[PDB]
Amino acid sequence: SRPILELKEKIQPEILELIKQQRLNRLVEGTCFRKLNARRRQDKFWYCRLSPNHKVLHYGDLEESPQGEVPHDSLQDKLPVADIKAVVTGKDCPHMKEKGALKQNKEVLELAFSILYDSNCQLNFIAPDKHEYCIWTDGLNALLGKDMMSDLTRNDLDTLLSMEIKLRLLDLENIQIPDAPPPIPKEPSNYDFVYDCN
Amino acid sequence: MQAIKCVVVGDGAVAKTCLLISYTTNAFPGEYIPTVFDNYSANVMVDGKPVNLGLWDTAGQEDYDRLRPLSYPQTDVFLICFSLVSPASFENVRAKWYPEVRHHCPNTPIILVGTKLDLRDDKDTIEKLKEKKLTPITYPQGLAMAKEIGAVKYLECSALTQRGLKTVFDEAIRAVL
Amino acid sequence: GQGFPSFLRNKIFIYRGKEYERREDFSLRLLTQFPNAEKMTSTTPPGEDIKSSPKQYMQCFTVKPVMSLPPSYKDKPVPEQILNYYRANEVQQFRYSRPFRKGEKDPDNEFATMWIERTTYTTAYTFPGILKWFEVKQISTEEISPLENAIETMELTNERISNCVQQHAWDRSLSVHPLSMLLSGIVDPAVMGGFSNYEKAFFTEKYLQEHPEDQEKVELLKRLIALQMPLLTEGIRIHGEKLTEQLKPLHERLSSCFRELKEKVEKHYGVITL
């Protein structure tokens, strides 16, 4: 399966772009995200909707909405995607290093993601669980045009690439791929096709 | 339909009046017309219902410390202001402005606001401050000042960019709201 | 830009926004309407390259709704409601004040260079219409000298005083805070003294070799401040009708400075009052 494996991993890009468009679709549909220490009458649920243009984010302190995203002008309908330095994950989020009233506890170590913008403004947000945290980070990194950091993303990569090549080798049933590629027979220098082209 | 009292003080070396007028004018950045009079006002919707408001523009000259306080009573919210690029402004506010404002009105929602935020990160401005031995004092110690008073908000904006300026007024008027 | 459609490329519109849209709120709203959402910064002129270049470029700014002309109302002592209706709707004319420096940029003064290149805007239809926006049908610009600039600033301040005076004059259950606002500001051209600024600007003979034949304007301004004086007088008396003890030191300052400027215009500016 060495030619098989090299062929499978060598035609990578389609699944990669496929997955990342799926990611950005998920970002656009989004959901109500989570704030910091939204306890004393603070709406911990609030939607962060990416534009279908995928350039502006529709977000802010919306109500405790179980339904999730609601289509309207959010509190802030812009996140400048052209100047997001990065999103810090984990202890790199300064809001975790807060030791006063905004002390995030040790059960949100994997839900910390602060969008860097304005070179001083951040968006320290929380995720309901790890899977969509990684999902959103993947989608943003796609907006960054970079690698994906969801374990589920690698899962999809592997399963779909394996399926795809699996459904390719039906033509080679009862045939073997020579590890050394077959020699290219000499092509006569003349291209005077005796038969008509097309 | 109602109006909101809103006072602003600060040294005359920052020209906060430019900020206020450019906001109320809805002026394009760097396009405000400087009027000849003070104490601006506007009629503002933010949430629920629109409201009026008048901005008590107060000159920072120390001699006027006898007419500034007579304006203070029944003030809904006050806005303490400074220059992010002026250490002397910091000395004034923590030494004169903040103290006496706290004494005259110890009971009013308060927000601290920066200025010349564009100049805060200006390389020429910061190098001039260094060669003049002044410090481009940054946000976190501004937050330290805020927590020192526990001002209901601290903000940083600019005139040539109007960044957060609208926001500045938004949390200003939502201090009551 | 050129990526814009046929009816949008190199086209200027006016949008009847919401009742209290801040400029950049509407700007952002339009940016939602349009990708490649950037802003050219030279608000006044177009860009000749961008007159043909792709990458659609836009710019937005609030404009002045030029007053209507309510027919058969031009001199009638009508109430304010009708005209306030006419201030916003049934409109086609729109001007934009253009700051400019023309002259020497002396430090203490700005009216050595104040020139306002207002641009009038005439659109085909009348707001409001079937569509909440319209291209400007005809564009034209204007000019304003520092003489002229002093003129409009002066007169506009005078009416603004008049409007506040009448609006409080018909309604008693009305806050006095604007009176404090306005009369304070009038009394102190505090950050800068506009009156002496006009004195140095035009009343001094220096302008009268700069503008010898254009001294028929300094007399205009002299009459303008002359007609100011009773308007401040109504301001003062209405303040007194709305005076309170906190305003009392304020009021006495207003009154003292009011007779100060009275005698000053009478002799120091030498203007003849009515």
Curated annotation (Swiss-Prot), chain A:
It comes from the Eukaryota. Residues 26-147 form the PH domain. Widely expressed, with a higher expression in the spleen and placenta. Phosphorylated by HCK. Signal peptide: none annotated. A motif (SH3-binding) lies at residues 178-185. The modification Phosphotyrosine is found at Y191. It is found in: Cytoplasm; Cell membrane. Interacts with ADGRB1. Interacts directly with the SH3-domain of DOCK1 via its SH3-binding site. Part of a complex with DOCK1 and RAC1. Part of a complex with DOCK1 and CRK isoform CRK-II. Interacts with PLEKHG6. Interacts with HCK (via SH3 domain). Interacts with ADGRB3. Interacts with DOCK5. Involved in cytoskeletal rearrangements required for phagocytosis of apoptotic cells and cell motility. Acts in association with DOCK1 and CRK. Was initially proposed to be required in complex with DOCK1 to activate Rac Rho small GTPases. May enhance the guanine nucleotide exchange factor (GEF) activity of DOCK1. This is Engulfment and cell motility protein 1. It comes from Homo sapiens (Human). The gene is ELMO1. The chain holds residues 530 to 727 of 727 of the full protein.
UniProtKB/Swiss-Prot annotation, chain B:
Regulated by guanine nucleotide exchange factors (GEFs) which promote the exchange of bound GDP for free GTP, GTPase activating proteins (GAPs) which increase the GTP hydrolysis activity, and GDP dissociation inhibitors which inhibit the dissociation of the nucleotide from the GTPase. GTP hydrolysis is stimulated by ARHGAP30. This is Ras-related C3 botulinum toxin substrate 1. Changing T17N: Constitutively inactivated. Abolishes interaction with PARD6 proteins. No effect on NR3C2 transcriptional activity. No interaction with PPP5C. Doesn't activate PPP5C phosphatase activity and translocate PPP5C to the plasma membrane. A motif (Effector region) lies at residues 32-40. The modification Phosphoserine is found at S71. The gene is RAC1. It holds the Pfam family Ras. One of its GO terms (biological process) is lamellipodium assembly.
UniProtKB/Swiss-Prot annotation, chain C:
Residues 1-274 form the DOCKER domain. It is found in: Cytoplasm; Cell membrane; Cell projection, Podosome. Interacts with CRK and CRKL. Interacts (via N-terminus) with tensin TNS3 (via N-terminus); the interaction increases DOCK5 guanine nucleotide exchange activity towards Rac. Interacts with ELMO1. Guanine nucleotide exchange factor (GEF) for Rho and Rac. GEF proteins activate small GTPases by exchanging bound GDP for free GTP. Along with DOCK1, mediates CRK/CRKL regulation of epithelial and endothelial cell spreading and migration on type IV collagen. The DOCKER domain may mediate some GEF activity. Belongs to the DOCK family. This is Dedicator of cytokinesis protein 5.
